[PDB]
């Protein structure tokens, strides 16, 4: 039939480094999670065919995360600026990506989008070439990403790897 | 899988 893949990341700044979190789904099932709040910060596969993997696989995955975190830390601060927000408080940037493939295996829709403090911030349109900007701050971001070629960067992923992986994954089941 | 995100905001 049809299928889907989603991955969510959230970073929450602290009054006192941001609490980073992630979780992945295919077909409304969790297949991995991460939380920098349990005593060991390590990825927890939730599905049999993932658990059986080399620990140098999970190593590289983890290395990537440390980067992504540092990215969140920097940009979280980029937002408080955009919104004239007090330095002392607590804010949450969240990000989701993924794809829906149809019955045919052909991508049916791709996603890439951020929400900030609960509210929609920016999101890649179904065309995979344009962005939708919730407000005045978001358009700034959009401009940067328009000129930087962000949409193209992620089309490559969404139309190719995002679909290829979902397939192998579903097959490994 | 991974599609890290690095573009500035």
């Amino acid at each position, epitope marked *: 039939g049809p299928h889907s893949m989603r991955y969510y990341e959230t970073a929450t700044s602290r009054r006192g480094e941001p609490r980073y979190t992630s979780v992945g789904y295919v077909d409304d099932k969790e297949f991995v999670r991460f939380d920098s709040d349990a005593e060991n910060p390590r990825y927890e596969p939730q599905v049999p065919w993932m658990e059986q993997e080399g620990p140098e696989y999970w190593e590289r995955i983890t290395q990537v995360a440390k*980067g992504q975190e*540092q990215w969140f*830390r920097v940009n979280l601060r*980029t937002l408080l600026g955009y919104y004239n927000q007090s330095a002392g408080g607590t804010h949450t940037l969240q990000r989701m990506y993924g794809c829906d493939v149809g019955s045919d295996g052909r991508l049916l829709r791709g996603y890439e989008q951020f929400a900030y403090d609960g509210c929609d911030y920016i999101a890649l349109n179904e065309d995979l070439r344009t962005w939708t900007a919730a407000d005045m701050a978001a358009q700034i971001t959009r401009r940067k990403w328009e000129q930087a070629g962000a949409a193209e960067y992620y*089309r*490559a992923y969404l139309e190719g*790897e995002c679909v290829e992986w979902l397939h192998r994954y579903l097959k490994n089941g | 899988f991974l599609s*890290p995100f690095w573009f*500035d905001i």
Partner: T-cell receptor, first 111, second 114 residues
Framework: AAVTQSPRNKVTVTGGNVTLSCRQT?????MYWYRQDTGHGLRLIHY???????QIGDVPDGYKATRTTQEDFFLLLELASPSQTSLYFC??????????FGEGSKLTVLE | AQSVTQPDARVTVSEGASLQLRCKYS??????LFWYVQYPRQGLQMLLK??????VVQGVNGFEAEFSKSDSSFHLRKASVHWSDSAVYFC????????????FGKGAKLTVSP
């Protein structure tokens, strides 16, 4: 385009202190310090995601970096060694793989 | 693991001739690719990027590159090289996860004979 290194030229003797500065007027979050030597191409010394972050690069030994503010990134050779005679490039970025370079700082450390 | 390889460090051609600089990339999906140029006594300049889409990328200065999935190829091309195009040309991929960092080729020093 405006990523500017200071000083363009510098000579010092083994044991000396050297400080290469780099200013970027884009509002880029990433900044990088590279060296370039014939036979080794471009090698990354240290970089930074954004203000107050440092990341080690491929050849950090002997160098420290400081990202005080959003637009200033400094390379610091606190005890300079002949090995370090070379040409250094600063670069800013706001997207994967897209770096905007400064013009070079040529440094000789004399034994 | 994600490298890119340039075959020749030194290369010479004649004013007017047509240029092809070879760049092969270690396999990755999905590849993000770049050509940078370094004019004498200067820094690197981004020539062009390939993120997705048209596998024939138009850079500035009448340069262009062709993304070949088939080959693992990202060849840089110009039709009629003038002399001012003498410079060093760098190929580069932006690994994923290794994405904050750009990973360079060795470089190709191009000499356009007048």
């Amino acid at each position: 385009a405006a990523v500017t290194q200071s000083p363009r030229n510098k000579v010092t003797v083994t044991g000396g202190n050297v400080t290469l500065s780099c200013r970027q007027t884009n509002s880029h979050n990433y900044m990088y310090w590279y060296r370039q030597d014939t036979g080794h191409g471009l090698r990354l010394i240290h970089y930074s995601y954004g203000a107050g972050n440092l990341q080690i690069g491929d050849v950090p030994d002997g160098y420290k970096a400081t990202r005080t503010t959003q637009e200033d990134f400094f390379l610091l050779l606190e005890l300079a060694s002949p090995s370090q005679t070379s040409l250094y490039f600063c670069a800013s970025s706001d997207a994967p793989g897209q770096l905007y370079f400064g013009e070079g700082s040529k440094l000789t450390v004399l034994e | 693991a994600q490298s890119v390889t340039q075959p020749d460090a030194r290369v010479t051609v004649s004013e007017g001739a047509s240029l092809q600089l070879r760049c092969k990339y270690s396999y990755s999906a999905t590849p993000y690719l770049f050509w940078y140029v370094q004019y004498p006594r200067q820094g690197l300049q981004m020539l062009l990027k390939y993120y997705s889409g048209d596998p024939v990328v138009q850079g500035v200065n009448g340069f262009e590159a062709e993304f070949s999935k088939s080959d693992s190829s990202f060849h840089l091309r110009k039709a009629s090289v003038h002399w001012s195009d003498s410079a060093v040309y760098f190929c580069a991929v932006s690994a994923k996860g290794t994405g904050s960092k750009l990973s360079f080729g060795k470089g190709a020093k191009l000499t356009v004979s007048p």
